[PDB]
Design a protein around this ligand. Structure first.
Ligand SMILES: NC(=O)c1ccc[n+]([C@@H]2O[C@H](COP(=O)([O-])OP(=O)(O)OC[C@H]3O[C@@H](n4cnc5c(N)ncnc54)[C@H](OP(=O)(O)O)[C@@H]3O)[C@@H](O)[C@H]2O)c1
Ligand SMILES: NC(=O)c1ccc[n+]([C@@H]2O[C@H](COP(=O)([O-])OP(=O)(O)OC[C@H]3O[C@@H](n4cnc5c(N)ncnc54)[C@H](O)[C@@H]3O)[C@@H](O)[C@H]2O)c1
Lengths: 167, 366, 364
């Protein structure tokens, strides 16, 4: 997370992606404080709430209201593709399969033809996954391996919780 | 014999019974014999053998009336007055300020008339306070029948295709019913809001999960003021642009509900929306409200004046009315024992005891 | 002519409150580079101000004019008169139920329209964004909770009320897919005691996440009867059975026996969401409620997906928006009828008269 801190302040645009990690780890409550802080810094934040991600439709949408995250920055399944390219630190809070190329580009993942958030080769895609483990697949997707698209080997809450005070 | 009689509600199109099986059990515990009419709860889905599950004597028709406690679910109609017996602890929704005629009539029947609506509205008494418990249930149920006719979800959610926005619910005239309506909408995941003159309710509104809309401006003097009714109508004009549910709540016992929202402004409200008028059982706080119906305002605000709302959630209203009645009979049968010790020094009981054994004892120490 | 213009009919189905797109959805369609036309009186169904369609950006046409467009985004089948209005070429996009509607198919093929079956979108993952049945089931999941609470005896929420403690609703969601998930969400939000069941292992994690008891699997034969035994022994304890269990293209199995219903607690509701495609409960009176002796409101509302006017119109409309996103990927404003992608290849049951049903076998 010590990286992700410096990375955040660099970003200008930040896509926060709520895919499962957010919810399970309660990372939505602390995210609300840090995003508010990023807002004060002047950072173009977009939450990309793709519904079909991990567990149940909506869910994390109202969980962000619980966290008291503004619905202005909550973009629910808005295909904010052009901002995706413009974004530097995409905080992929878990969410690997919801952004997984091998689900649509390759018809390969069990989630057959998943409309994944096309954020590969953005400016940075820090995928909060504590291991290269199978999500609903995550077969061979550059989001695991690459330099900008890379697995942050930390928990969803834990990583947010450090960057919350670090930044 | 000290037998509690649980009737069916024989008022036309009321949906309660006095007690559900679970609550009948609680009346057994009280040390009285408990008899329920032949399948009295079928309005609220519980038959004879369902009350045999609780362990209730199924009094076969009229023998229900021959009992020293009759937990009537609403007022006796003259039919039932004739059926009542003197000396009986007739514990019911009497509505004394709405029913001075009934007061004179039950005085002639010489009954101990305990008006369940007329409990002193204080902390300790809230468990006995049927007025507020049924209002509370009706508040929850107003939110229900609002989602029955609502265009949208309360529950904001991105679905596999599209965004559902969280609904904006404005409760207006926040009685206890309004507070529970906030709790209901909040459980469903709606942006809840509330307005009333009285600052006492705000604490609860904020807690159960809502924005208490300030009067963009004593409490009675304020409430009467012309600029105040302007200011209310400005809060209403403002919310009309955005809201999804309005719950019109300010029901007064006796007085018809103040017609707050002028018809014009309802037409101006955001369409695909509901105004559930709880206050519809006397007057109703919207001016559109024809009691009984869903009047769809031509924009698409269905002003649902369901007068029968406290009835409408049948087993709940029965369960909790039953629990208010058990609560009363707890302090009425403190020893157990099983004898109706009607208290006077306990001023809340002195409240509810609007008539005792003939002589009208209404009103009561405030 | 009216290429690049949409036509949205006022829907003429009985027990209907949907239009194909509400004002917000009309704006969506506008954003997609199209122009919209809607029939007059659509608002009345959708409980929305009809003038607000114009205010949003729709030509509120008087009626049949709607049919002369690029795409006719329409909710249910074209009735046979509407069929005779369908313009040769025009991309018609509706609930077709292809295999169930052989003759309707033929009539639309003669009318030479580009029929896309919004119900029969080949149900993989991006398909669900396009699939009208996803949103309709999701409508019905919430709507199971609502219509349940319309006839429910108790609260959902275990509110320790002033009067006394509430025994909560135990919401036994059978068939946790899509509508099941929405019912689980809604009931969990209320803090009703959710118990849910679905065949696929993935739902287990989800039910567990919502503080909700997952009913274990004890398949197909032999198991179908153990599902029955679970649902009976569970029906004793539960309140609201949200019976979603539907297998696409098959009638909903009669898992809720009348006997099972009459064994339950009173004051309770079994909502058949799968009512229209088979009836999962037996006691399901299609298009009505029926209260039993024991006191369970079996709500067999076939019309559940229609029952929530503005949002149903919104979400069906956004399924259409997602379809036009995959079709008109440039968002140029005319219907690029994509055949390269599997999903459009399957949903376009009839490309302009030529019956292009199905897609090559894309295993769901
Ligand atoms: N939401 C719905 O409506 C719904 C319904 C049904 C199915 N689904 C499906 O779920 C699919 C996958 O979505 P998804 O990628 O969001 O979820 P997922 O596949 O369940 O999770 C993906 C990854 O998130 C990581 N993660 C979880 N908790 C985290 C934490 N505490 N700390 C760090 N990393 C965390 C895990 O990696 P580590 O183990 O290494 O941490 C896991 O491999 C969707 O494409 C959709 O098909 C969604
Ligand atoms: N990738 C995603 O995030 C996503 C999300 C939702 C659905 N889907 C797709 O939807 C497709 C079809 O499923 P659906 O849910 O839309 O269908 P549906 O609405 O016709 O059926 C609803 C549910 O009923 C369940 N059911 C059937 N028989 C059952 C039984 N005997 N006991 C218990 N439950 C039973 C099914 O499992 C299904 O989930 C799936 O193959 C999947 O590809 C994908």
């Amino acid at each position: 997370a010590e990286e992700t801190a410096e990375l955040l302040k660099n970003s200008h645009s930040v896509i926060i992606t709520p895919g499962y990690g957010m919810a399970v780890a309660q990372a939505q409550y602390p995210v609300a404080e840090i995003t508010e802080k990023l807002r004060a810094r002047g950072i173009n934040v977009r939450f990309g709430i793709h519904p079909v991600a991990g567990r149940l439709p909506g869910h994390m949408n109202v969980l962000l209201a619980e966290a008291k995250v503004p619905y202005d920055i909550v973009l629910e399944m808005d295909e904010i593709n052009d901002d995706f390219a413009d974004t530097d630190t995409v905080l992929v809070i878990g969410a690997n399969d919801t952004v997984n190329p091998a689900a649509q580009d390759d018809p390969k993942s069990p989630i057959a033809g998943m409309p994944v958030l096309e954020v590969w080769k953005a400016q940075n895609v820090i995928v909060f996954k504590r291991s290269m483990n199978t999500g609903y697949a995550g077969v061979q997707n550059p989001l695991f391996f690459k330099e900008n698209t890379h697995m942050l080997f930390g928990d969803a809450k834990a990583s947010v919780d450090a960057i919350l005070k670090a930044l | 014999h000290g037998r509690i009689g649980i009737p069916r509600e024989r008022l036309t199109n009321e949906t309660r019974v006095a007690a559900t099986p679970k609550t009948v059990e609680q009346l057994l515990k009280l040390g009285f014999t408990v008899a329920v009419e032949s399948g009295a709860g079928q309005l609220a889905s519980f038959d004879d053998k369902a009350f045999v599950q609780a362990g209730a004597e199924i009094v076969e028709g009229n023998s229900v009336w021959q009992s020293e406690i009759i937990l009537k679910v609403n007022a006796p109609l003259d039919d039932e007055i004739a059926l009542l017996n003197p000396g009986t602890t007739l514990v019911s929704f009497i509505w004394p300020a709405q029913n001075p005629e009934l007061m004179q009539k039950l005085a002639e029947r010489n009954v101990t008339v305990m008006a369940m609506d007329s409990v002193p509205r204080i902390s300790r008494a809230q468990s006995l306070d049927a007025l507020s418990s049924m209002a509370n249930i009706a508040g929850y149920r107003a939110i229900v029948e609002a989602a029955h006719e609502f265009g949208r979800f309360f529950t904001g959610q991105i679905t596999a295709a599209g965004k559902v926005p969280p609904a904006k619910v404005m409760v207006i005239g926040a009685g206890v019913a309004g507070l529970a309506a906030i709790g209901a909408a909040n459980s469903l995941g709606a942006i809840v809001r509330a307005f009333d003159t009285r600052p006492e309710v705000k604490e609860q509104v904020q807690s159960m999960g809502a924005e208490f809309l300030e009067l963009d401006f004593d409490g009675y003097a304020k409430v009467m003021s012309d600029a105040f009714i302007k200011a209310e109508m400005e809060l209403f004009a403002a919310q009309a642009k955005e809201v999804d549910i309005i719950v019109t709540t300010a029901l007064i016992p006796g007085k018809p509900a103040p017609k707050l929202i002028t018809r014009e402004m309802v037409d101006s409200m955001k369409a695909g929306s509901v105004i559930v008028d709880l206050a519809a059982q006397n007057g109703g706080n919207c001016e559109y409200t024809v009691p009984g119906e869903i009047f769809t305002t031509e924009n698409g605000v269905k002003v649902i004046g369901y007068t029968d709302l406290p009835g409408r959630l049948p087993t709940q209203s029965s369960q909790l009315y039953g629990t208010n009645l058990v609560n009363l009979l707890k302090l009425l049968c403190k020893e157990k024992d099983g004898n109706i010790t009607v208290d006077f020094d306990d001023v809340v009981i002195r409240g509810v005891t609007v008539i005792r054994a003939g002589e009208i004892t209404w009103p009561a120490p405030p």
